[PDB]
Amino acid sequence: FRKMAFPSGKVEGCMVQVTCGTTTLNGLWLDDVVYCPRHVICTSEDMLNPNYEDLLIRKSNHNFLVQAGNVQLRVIGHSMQNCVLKLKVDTANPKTPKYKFVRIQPGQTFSVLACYNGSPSGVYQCAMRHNFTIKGSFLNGSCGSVGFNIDYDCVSFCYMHHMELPTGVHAGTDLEGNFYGPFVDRQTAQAAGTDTTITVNVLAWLYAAVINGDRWFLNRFTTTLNDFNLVAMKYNYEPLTQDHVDILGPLSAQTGIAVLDMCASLKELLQNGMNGRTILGSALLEDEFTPFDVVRQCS
Amino acid sequence: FRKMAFPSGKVEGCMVQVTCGTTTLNGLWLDDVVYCPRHVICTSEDMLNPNYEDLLIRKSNHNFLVQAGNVQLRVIGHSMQNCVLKLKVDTANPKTPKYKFVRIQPGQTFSVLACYNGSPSGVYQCAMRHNFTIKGSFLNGSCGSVGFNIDYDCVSFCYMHHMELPTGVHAGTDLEGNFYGPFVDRQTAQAAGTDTTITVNVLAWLYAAVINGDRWFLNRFTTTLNDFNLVAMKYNYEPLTQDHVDILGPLSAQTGIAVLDMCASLKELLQNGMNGRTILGSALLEDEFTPFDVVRQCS
Ligand SMILES: Cn1cnc(Cn2c(=O)nc(Nc3cc4cn(C)nc4cc3Cl)n(Cc3cc(F)c(F)cc3F)c2=O)n1
Numbered sequence A, B: 001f002r003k004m005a006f007p008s009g010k011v012e013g014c015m016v017q018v019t020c021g022t023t024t025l026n027g028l029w030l031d032d033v034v035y036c037p038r039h040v041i042c043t044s045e046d047m048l049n050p051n052y053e054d055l056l057i058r059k060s061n062h063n064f065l066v067q068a069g070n071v072q073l074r075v076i077g078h079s080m081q082n083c084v085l086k087l088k089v090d091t092a093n094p095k096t097p098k099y100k101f102v103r104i105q106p107g108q109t110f111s112v113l114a115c116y117n118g119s120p121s122g123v124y125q126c127a128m129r130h131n132f133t134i135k136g137s138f139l140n141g142s143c144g145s146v147g148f149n150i151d152y153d154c155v156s157f158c159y160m161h162h163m164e165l166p167t168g169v170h171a172g173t174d175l176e177g178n179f180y181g182p183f184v185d186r187q188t189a190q191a192a193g194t195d196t197t198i199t200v201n202v203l204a205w206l207y208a209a210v211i212n213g214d215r216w217f218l219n220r221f222t223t224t225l226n227d228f229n230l231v232a233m234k235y236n237y238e239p240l241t242q243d244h245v246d247i248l249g250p251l252s253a254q255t256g257i258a259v260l261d262m263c264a265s266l267k268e269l270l271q272n273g274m275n276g277r278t279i280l281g282s283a284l285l286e287d288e289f290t291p292f293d294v295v296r297q298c299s
């Protein structure tokens, strides 16, 4: 098992650079609109405690430099939606894919196209942690890089990168400009909430093991969901939601192992450990493969 | 710090489907030639023990169906170069990138674009191992997927996927059709040579751990190159050369940790184990990052 990103071509053709004075970052060009973090309108002095409403009134269309490669896209309108800037440009992107804007739940994975100065650099899979941060790999100049999933040629954009936290994890918004988690777009020290293990994904990893014939940890017990959630919290595992139980449906049907029976097996592993035994050739439980990721790799 | 692949868009526009009878796999369309594994000309009976020159002489151009998306390309010529079939087509691929064909050395990494029926499915980083296998993520229908590196807009193709060995590792050729390793393109069980660990890559990754703030494995011991290499060989690690030491120069400069001091750290890890601790979230010693991979992602 390894982390597999979606092919990035449909997103590469949408990346542009957006510059305001000397502040520069990445934006996303879809039809005739460029979406980017509103942080671009900040001078160095504004980044600590920006007054975004005040900073925008000073700005006119001709203050925004938008470039696809070295080709300038003239801005003909600008607005602010939550923490994203929307720049209307005079050219509709001929490479615009079929796309949606989605807001993802914690545990869900997505592909990140890391970009610098509008130029795509690399692609990798990330998971949204339950404290609404991601353990990404980002350098300076990456602000505005996006995260996405692809279903049947349709790109669902779910993340726009804004900042690095002191602990080295990363925080950002959806493509409507709403932050994931309790963060704000200022250059101030903000702490990630305490992280938890992503229970739904650990359960998917256990189903993956079963599919590949590694099933020693299957015990003879069952549990209720309420009983399991209360126990899981004592081991810094996330409580399961009703949506979590349902996205485990396909793996449960494939293996014939009821979701609640697998929760009982996981509860046993938490209360007693693994005793030098491995699962999928590993002594650590993996929590960054979703049920969908598992089916992608197994079938 | 993460395993990061190159953006795949320049390769996506070159993937097509090749079909001969009921046998089908992926091909690479560059200018007016489609490159694909010659295994495509085998029926299920042929696959077990194929005489390829005999099989190819009995084929005509119209025995080859090539589809790019929904568009059918007409084959107007064919030839075989080692294990690679070259189909001349009546249309040049307008999305052909600047490209080269290169044969890589063990320890070097590349990006894989996994494809099924000519449609790209995922992208991830792999390394050529010392026994000329790769630990990929490939399912049925992935034959003909390619591996590549991207250097300022030029795609250097280095791998064409052929088969999965009974241990689950993968084997393939360069784009001139020569296998990496002692394998042949026939459906028979094939084992690889002993899998020696890429020592210079493990050292690069330990330097990545330091650069990313993890230092528990460092120590005050010292070692000579030969004394380290004695322990390395004992543990089936590749001997470290002065060229490897030189290549690690920039990382030792950045961290102030001498290369032979990092060797002392690795020697203890090999002799004592990790004591349940982890490095960069991994419970085992990672050997699929090159010094350049670490430099590029950390800077
Ligand atoms: C190491 N790292 C990992 N992720 C990041 C993301 N990131 C970023 O790329 N840039 C940021 N500040 C800027 C500085 C600029 C200097 N010039 C010339 N232009 C610049 C543009 C930007 Cl955006 N930041 C900091 C940051 C960005 C925000 F959007 C925000 F709301 C708060 C912040 F503190 C940053 O985190 N760097």
Ligand SMILES: Cn1cnc(Cn2c(=O)nc(Nc3cc4cn(C)nc4cc3Cl)n(Cc3cc(F)c(F)cc3F)c2=O)n1
Residues within 6 Å of the ligand: B022, B023, B024, B025, B037, B039, B040, B138, B139, B140, B141, B142, B143, B162, B163, B164, B184, B185, B186, B187, B188
């Ligand atoms: C599980 N896995 C991981 N990697 C692979 C790659 N792979 C593959 O995709 N296909 C193969 N055999 C074929 C069967 C076909 C059935 N039809 C209808 N069409 C087919 C086309 C192919 Cl290529 N193989 C096996 C294989 C492929 C070779 F190129 C070879 F030289 C020897 C082999 F044993 C395969 O490994 N599968």
